[PDB]
């Protein structure tokens, strides 16, 4: 037999509208239509009737725009932060194929779509045909990006750190806030070097923090290891950093989204001595999605 | 513009720093095994020879005699106060002190050579450590000619 009906959604601007990609589990890359905060979502729900002769008794058809956060792969933990309904049909029958127009006016989409370890945040259209014991349901996923402009203030991070009477260094990264295709321009300056350093590297680290209060899991992922020095410096030695962020395709910083989760980035400077002892200093950076002109 | 050639500005390096000798020199050599005693209280001693230019060590050159128990004493002193996960020693060989083996026991040459290398392995990892250089036991061990356990 198969299914009695097949629900398809088609957006009015489905030719001209730009799509986007998302890295899911096991390296898969799904591509969905891109939307921005305040845009209207509108199109057609198309019901293809598959079994001619037969009839489809329903207690109503609707379409929902949904944006929700999912935690720990646990259906019971899902929280919808945006829900909009359009009733498409009263209780009735369907003998043949039909299509329904829908339009959600100027839809609020306060968060950027995210897929992480313990958190997903996704938007979708959910068409539902209500039936006596089991509803026919069709989801249609959308990416939403959240944009921003050049920040009012953007101070360079500059800091002396060390091990007392062994190693003193001053490091500097040119900004505190970097866009997703920006560049870490920085330097390391050696004030005192009484250890034998083999190499130094700059790492970019992604932390994903989930939960509330003492309920706090953190998932750390090291997105880049970038060697910046090879060999032992002396005092007065400057080491240039130029790390292009386009090569690692990171997400923006996301801070207390719906008071549920955060995702934050960190430049972890790591030196390593001849006996493989490892000295480090972590610094948060804000990543942000630049609005194209 | 075709290429991003951005760097932060740097302070030129002072010439005395650039060419003058580095401030991180530290080599320790465990060498020359010798049997001190006769009969039942025999033991091997090794010459622990230091060279350095770090200001935390009182002598830039020193040469002292040490026993495997002295290495065991040092590791026990650092394990208690220092909060440094201390590297292992080459091993207490009890079964080598047992009688009528097919080798010279604790004075076997392969054993002494392998012990000796493992002590140099140990002492260079411990003496290079930043937190271990602050402890008084390390300077007592390397640069005093006899250890004062009290």
């Amino acid at each position: 037999f198969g299914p009695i009906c097949e629900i398809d959604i088609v957006l009015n601007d489905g030719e001209t509208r730009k799509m986007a990609e998302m890295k899911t589990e096991d390296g898969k890359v799904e591509k969905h239509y891109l939307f921005y905060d305040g845009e209207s979502v509108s199109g057609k729900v198309n019901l293809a009737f598959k079994q001619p002769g037969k009839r489809l008794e329903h207690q109503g058809i609707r379409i929902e725009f949904v944006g929700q956060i999912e935690l720990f792969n646990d259906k019971s933990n899902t929280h919808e932060f945006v829900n909009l309904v359009k009733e498409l049909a009263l209780p009735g029958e369907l003998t043949q194929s039909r299509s329904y127009d829908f339009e959600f006016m100027q839809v609020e989409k306060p968060y950027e779509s995210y897929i992480g370890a313990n958190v997903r945040l996704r938007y979708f259209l959910k068409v539902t045909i209500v039936r006596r014991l089991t509803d026919l349901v069709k989801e249609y996923d959308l990416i939403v990006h959240q944009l921003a402009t050049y920040p009012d203030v953007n101070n360079s991070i500059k800091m002396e750190v060390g091990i007392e009477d062994c190693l003193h260094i001053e490091f500097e990264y040119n900004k505190s806030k970097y866009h997703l295709k920006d560049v870490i321009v920085g330097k390391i300056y050696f004030l005192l070097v009484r250890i034998k350093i083999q190499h130094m590297e700059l790492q970019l680290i992604k932390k994903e923090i989930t939960g509330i209060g003492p309920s706090t899991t953190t998932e750390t992922e090291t997105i880049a290891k970038y060697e910046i020095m090879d060999g032992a410096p002396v005092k007065g030695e400057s080491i240039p950093i130029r790390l292009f962020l386009a090569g690692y395709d990171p997400t923006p910083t996301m801070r207390d989204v719906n008071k549920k989760f955060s995702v934050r980035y960190f430049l972890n400077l790591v030196l390593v001595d001849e006996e493989d002892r490892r000295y480090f200093k972590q610094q948060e950076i804000i990543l942000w999605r630049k609005a194209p002109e | 513009t075709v290429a991003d050639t951005r760097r932060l500005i740097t302070k030129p390096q002072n010439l005395n720093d650039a060419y003058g000798p580095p401030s991180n020199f530290l080599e320790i050599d465990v060498s020359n095994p010798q049997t001190v005693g006769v009969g039942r209280g025999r033991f091997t001693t090794y010459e622990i020879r230091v060279k350095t230019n770090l200001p935390i060590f009182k002598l830039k050159e020193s040469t002292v005699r040490r026993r495997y128990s002295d290495f065991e004493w040092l590791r026990s002193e650092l394990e208690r106060e220092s909060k440094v996960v201390v590297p292992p020693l080459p091993g207490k060989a009890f079964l080598r002190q047992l009688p009528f083996r097919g080798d010279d026991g604790i004075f076997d040459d392969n054993f002494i050579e392998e012990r000796k290398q493992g002590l140099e392995q140990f002492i260079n990892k411990v003496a290079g450590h930043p937190l271990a250089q602050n402890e008084r036991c390390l300077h007592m061990f390397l640069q005093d000619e006899i250890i004062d356990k009290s």
């Binding site: 060390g162 190693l167 000295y279 480090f280 | -």
Partner: peptide, 11 residues
């Protein structure tokens, strides 16, 4: 296994 040491902020 690998010895990590946080670099202290200097006065």
């Amino acid at each position: 296994q690998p010895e990590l040491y946080l670099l202290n902020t200097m006065s």
